[PDB]
Enzyme design. Structure first.
Site, PDB file in Angstrom:
ATOM      1  N   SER A  44      25.954  54.023  32.984  1.00 29.27           N
ATOM      2  CA  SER A  44      24.910  55.082  33.231  1.00 29.27           C
ATOM      3  C   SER A  44      23.695  54.165  33.427  1.00 29.27           C
ATOM      4  O   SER A  44      22.138  55.172  33.110  1.00 29.27           O
ATOM      5  CB  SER A  44      25.541  56.269  32.006  1.00 29.27           C
ATOM      6  OG  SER A  44      27.430  57.269  33.006  1.00 29.27           O
ATOM      7  N   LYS A  47      21.782  55.395  36.125  1.00 23.33           N
ATOM      8  CA  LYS A  47      20.932  57.037  36.918  1.00 23.33           C
ATOM      9  C   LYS A  47      19.277  56.721  36.192  1.00 23.33           C
ATOM     10  O   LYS A  47      18.746  57.688  37.331  1.00 23.33           O
ATOM     11  CB  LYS A  47      21.742  57.986  35.213  1.00 23.33           C
ATOM     12  CG  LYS A  47      23.228  57.703  35.745  1.00 23.33           C
ATOM     13  CD  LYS A  47      22.883  58.505  34.771  1.00 23.33           C
ATOM     14  CE  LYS A  47      25.079  59.180  34.741  1.00 23.33           C
ATOM     15  NZ  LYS A  47      26.361  58.329  34.656  1.00 23.33           N
ATOM     16  N   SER A 104      23.816  62.469  30.796  1.00 22.45           N
ATOM     17  CA  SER A 104      24.610  61.581  31.347  1.00 22.45           C
ATOM     18  C   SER A 104      25.641  62.303  32.603  1.00 22.45           C
ATOM     19  O   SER A 104      27.120  61.733  32.580  1.00 22.45           O
ATOM     20  CB  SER A 104      25.423  60.991  30.040  1.00 22.45           C
ATOM     21  OG  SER A 104      25.615  59.402  30.961  1.00 22.45           O
ATOM     22  N   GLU A 140      29.887  57.813  41.130  1.00 22.23           N
ATOM     23  CA  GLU A 140      30.397  57.703  39.874  1.00 22.23           C
ATOM     24  C   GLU A 140      31.929  58.406  40.281  1.00 22.23           C
ATOM     25  O   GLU A 140      32.230  59.488  40.726  1.00 22.23           O
ATOM     26  CB  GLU A 140      29.746  58.623  38.913  1.00 22.23           C
ATOM     27  CG  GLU A 140      28.706  57.940  37.848  1.00 22.23           C
ATOM     28  CD  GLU A 140      28.588  57.791  37.328  1.00 22.23           C
ATOM     29  OE1 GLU A 140      27.744  56.927  36.511  1.00 22.23           O
ATOM     30  OE2 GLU A 140      29.615  57.184  36.658  1.00 22.23           O
ATOM     31  N   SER A 211      27.712  53.623  28.544  1.00 23.59           N
ATOM     32  CA  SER A 211      28.688  52.620  28.139  1.00 23.59           C
ATOM     33  C   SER A 211      30.437  52.566  30.079  1.00 23.59           C
ATOM     34  O   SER A 211      29.992  53.269  30.983  1.00 23.59           O
ATOM     35  CB  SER A 211      29.786  53.161  27.215  1.00 23.59           C
ATOM     36  OG  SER A 211      29.800  54.347  28.184  1.00 23.59           O
TER      37      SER A 211
END
Length: 262
Positions: A44, A47, A104, A140, A211
């Site tokens: 992440s 992002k 997130s 994602e 993660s």
């Protein structure tokens, strides 16, 4: 190899995994690197790159951040803390950026990638600001597989550190866009046990954690101590086993060693 590197190497050795660190002290523009040219899965932390790219678009589309964006059931993926509050409604590109950076939210990330024309559009923004190393290949949640040796969806600590500098302190973005990115990063709510937990309490931090699989545990941050120039710190960590548990403590401890090295 310096004192800081011996400690980072011992930290790494005690952890049983692979650690990557890059600091940019914008005093003497000094750098501290540990495996700083090795590739790590971004998870992440990517992002930031997607939100920065939508920001850059909004420079010429002055009302882009207020554009409503449909959230349909099918758009939900594996982890959507905010977007699930708006299924069959809308969210603006501002609310989607904030959700991605602060909570997130993976549906929010996927809406940013679509706005940019696919993962290739995020990579294109990186190339357009000097970063030849960043690469976003998937959406994602499949970008988190963090398979050892897989170059998909990776960068290096050196590369991301420089990039994060340009975005939050330099002028890769318009000032207005840069300030909105800083606000978003400071108001992050999910990266407290990582870099933030190894730094002096009085320093200000904007950051983004990540993660995934192989116990990949990452954090990238811009830091404002009091009295001195800001710094940029990137800490990537990944492990040999696919089911490995998260190790945010390793990132905090790397941050502690770096700051003890100032």
């Amino acid at each position: 190899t310096s004192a800081v590197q011996q400690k980072l190497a011992a930290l790494e050795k005690s952890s049983g995994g692979r650690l990557g660190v890059a600091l940019i002290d914008t005093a003497d523009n000094t750098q501290v690197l540990y495996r700083g040219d090795e590739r790590f899965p971004m998870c992440s932390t990517s992002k930031v790159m997607a939100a920065a790219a939508v920001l850059k678009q909004s420079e010429t589309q002055k009302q882009l951040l207020n554009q409503p964006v449909e959230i349909k059931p099918a758009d939900l993926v594996n982890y959507n803390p905010i977007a699930e509050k708006h299924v069959n409604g809308t969210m603006t590109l501002a609310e989607l950026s904030a959700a991605a950076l602060q909570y997130s939210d993976n549906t929010a990330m996927n809406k940013l990638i679509a706005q940019l024309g696919g993962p290739g559009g995020v990579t294109a923004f990186a190339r357009a600001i000097g970063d030849e190393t960043f690469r976003l290949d998937r959406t994602e949640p499949t970008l988190n597989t963090a398979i050892p040796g897989d170059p998909r969806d990776t960068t290096t600590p050196r590369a991301m550190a420089q990039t994060l500098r340009q975005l939050t302190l330099g002028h890769a973005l318009g000032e207005t866009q840069r300030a909105q990115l800083v606000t978003w990063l400071k108001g992050n709510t999910t990266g407290a046990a990582s870099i933030r937990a190894g730094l002096p309490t009085s320093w200000t931090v904007g950051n983004k954690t990540g993660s995934g699989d192989y116990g990949t545990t990452n954090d990238i941050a811009v830091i404002w101590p009091q009295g001195r120039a800001p710094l940029v710190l990137v800490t990537y960590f990944t492990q040999p086993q696919q089911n490995a548990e998260s190790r945010r403590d390793v990132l905090a401890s790397a941050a502690r060693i770096i700051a003890e090295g100032l």
